């Protein structure tokens, strides 16, 4: 009936936010000192605050080490160091920055940050004028979304240093006592459900179990990560704290007694709490055992988006 | 006093066309079978008429035995076939594409579009929709200007199948046949030869021109260090390109290097005189005047032709 490959192209009315991969292949083509200056004026504009409980991880004793002999070094120094992130240069900072998870990678530039406004960094240098190109990249990121805008930043992030590593705790599930249950008009597929219930309290034992074996998830603007072990892993380095907050949904028939459902609504990332909520679809292919045999989550082009459920 | 990654910011108010590797990345968004029809259409629908002797039997020799593979299989074998190509599956065929160059791959695919009309490779299906996403993309290519269309067209081609193949002998242009380059505004000869030996396809002379760790940047790609990798570049990418500088600016740097930018057209033998394509070269030359760096760039617009500040 389905393969994976095939799976990728339903509900494909789906608009979803290309201008964000676009724009970080932009940002690709700047060099190092344009990046950094960049990024460090789009944070500005962001006008959204990371959490304190986000700001106090305890991932980032992975990075004490490396993060105190960056302070420690001369401007002229750090400023290399920061270059050679951006430049993917092959040095032992950028190696050690390439075994780290995302959510340290960004911890890090976040103290940086940090540093540079209390002068214990090299800042963006007080006369510093973007590049032509640079400007343009800028002001098309003033222009999005503000979920768009912290993807396209964290997706510059993660791609810097060195090309693959750190082993991180995984949350503990919430108790069933402590749960609460998503609602949405026009869904009442148990499977569909259950994904976003178990993904709210962090319960990836259980969620994994909703797969088929040969049954695949695509992140956004990623390709298919196929069976079960490859997904599970996923889960516990890159799922964890997450708020699903679905809204609409539609469900119709597939072929060979496969079901299709598209969700859409709001996501809310730990790095922001209620701050930025991301306007996202769900496109399930459901086998006919009511397990999922494919599930994409895509970024959505616009709040339009969120209405868009015609098969 | 300079490296590389210090030289790539020379003349740093170019403008560059980076709406090309944006609509690369929305084009890599879309599954394999919107992407053939997308091209499909893309490539029906210019108004540019491709020659291949652009391509030389000891380069399609090598895609032979899998174009003669190809057109003994079933329609759905191709499409299969096809569709492992764009979505960069490890297959036989998939790696054996990985392996070529660039005109090679794009002779390929030349082959599999006039048997597609011919009815001899499976068509794209009759009536297909093009998914949302990938109509906007079909829409934003053909807004853009045909230099610029092109260079999407074969990025998208060339970053197709699983990531060698041993590239033939070019021969450079007999001396009596060769034409010299006038730039206005610039007379000094390295850049002059550089010039000269890319339109003659002498690049082992030319290779002699840079540093022993001198860069080329090619568009939208990270520079390409030391002459073994320059040199290597030069025959699987550069063979019969028509370079057509018209204008130029020098300025001294720091350390007695010299920095150099200039504009003008590029017609790729794929095209010939029907598409010329607007670039800058920006050099940054030694005290001794070899090339360290040079970077070659698409241009936003016509615009950026005129737009030669020191
Ligand atoms: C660098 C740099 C600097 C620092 C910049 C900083 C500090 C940037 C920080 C950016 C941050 C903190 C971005 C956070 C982004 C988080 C995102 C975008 C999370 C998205 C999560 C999603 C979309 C979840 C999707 C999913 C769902 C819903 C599923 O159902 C399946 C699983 C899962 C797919 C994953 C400084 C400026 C100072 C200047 C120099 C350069
Ligand atoms: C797939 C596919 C199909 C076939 C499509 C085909 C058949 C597409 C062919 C497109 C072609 C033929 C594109 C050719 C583009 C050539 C370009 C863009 C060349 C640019 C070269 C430049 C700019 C040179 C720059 C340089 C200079 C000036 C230097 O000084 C240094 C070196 C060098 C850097 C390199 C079919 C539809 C049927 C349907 C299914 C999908």
Do not use: H
């Not at 105190?68 to 040095?91: G, P, Y």
């Amino acid at each position: 009936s389905f393969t994976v490959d095939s799976a990728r192209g339903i509900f494909p009315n789906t608009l979803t936010a290309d201008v964000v991969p676009a724009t970080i292949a932009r940002f690709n083509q700047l060099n190092a000192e344009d990046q950094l200056a960049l990024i460090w004026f789009a944070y500005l504009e962001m006008g959204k605050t990371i959490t304190v409980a986000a700001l106090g991880a305890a991932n980032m004793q992975f990075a004490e080490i490396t993060m105190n002999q960056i302070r420690q070094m001369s401007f002229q120094e750090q400023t290399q160091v920061m270059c050679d992130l951006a430049n993917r240069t092959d040095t032992p900072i950028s190696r050690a920055y390439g075994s780290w998870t995302a959510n340290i990678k960004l911890g890090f530039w976040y103290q940086l940050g940090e540093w540079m406004a209390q002068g214990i960094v090299a800042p963006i240098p007080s006369g510093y004028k973007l590049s032509a190109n640079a400007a343009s990249v800028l002001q098309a990121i003033q222009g999005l979304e503000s979920g768009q805008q912290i993807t396209v930043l964290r997706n510059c992030v993660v791609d810097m240093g060195f090309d693959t590593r750190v082993s991180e705790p995984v949350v503990v599930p919430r108790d069933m006592a402590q749960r609460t249950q998503v609602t949405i008009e026009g869904i009442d597929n148990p499977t569909v459900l259950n994904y976003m219930n178990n993904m709210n309290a962090n319960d990836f034992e259980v969620l994994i179990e909703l797969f088929t074996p040969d049954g695949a998830l695509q992140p956004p603007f990623q390709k298919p990560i196929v069976g079960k072990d490859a997904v599970l892993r996923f889960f516990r380095e890159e799922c964890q704290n997450l708020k699903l907050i679905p809204e609409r949904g539609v469900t119709e028939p597939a072929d060979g007694g496969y079901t299709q459902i598209k969700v859409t609504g709001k996501v809310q990332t730990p790095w922001f709490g209620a701050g930025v909520g991301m306007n996202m679809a769900w496109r399930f292919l459901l086998s006919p055992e009511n397990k999922i045999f494919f599930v994409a989550i895509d970024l959505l082009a616009s709040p339009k988006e969120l209405l868009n459920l015609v098969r």
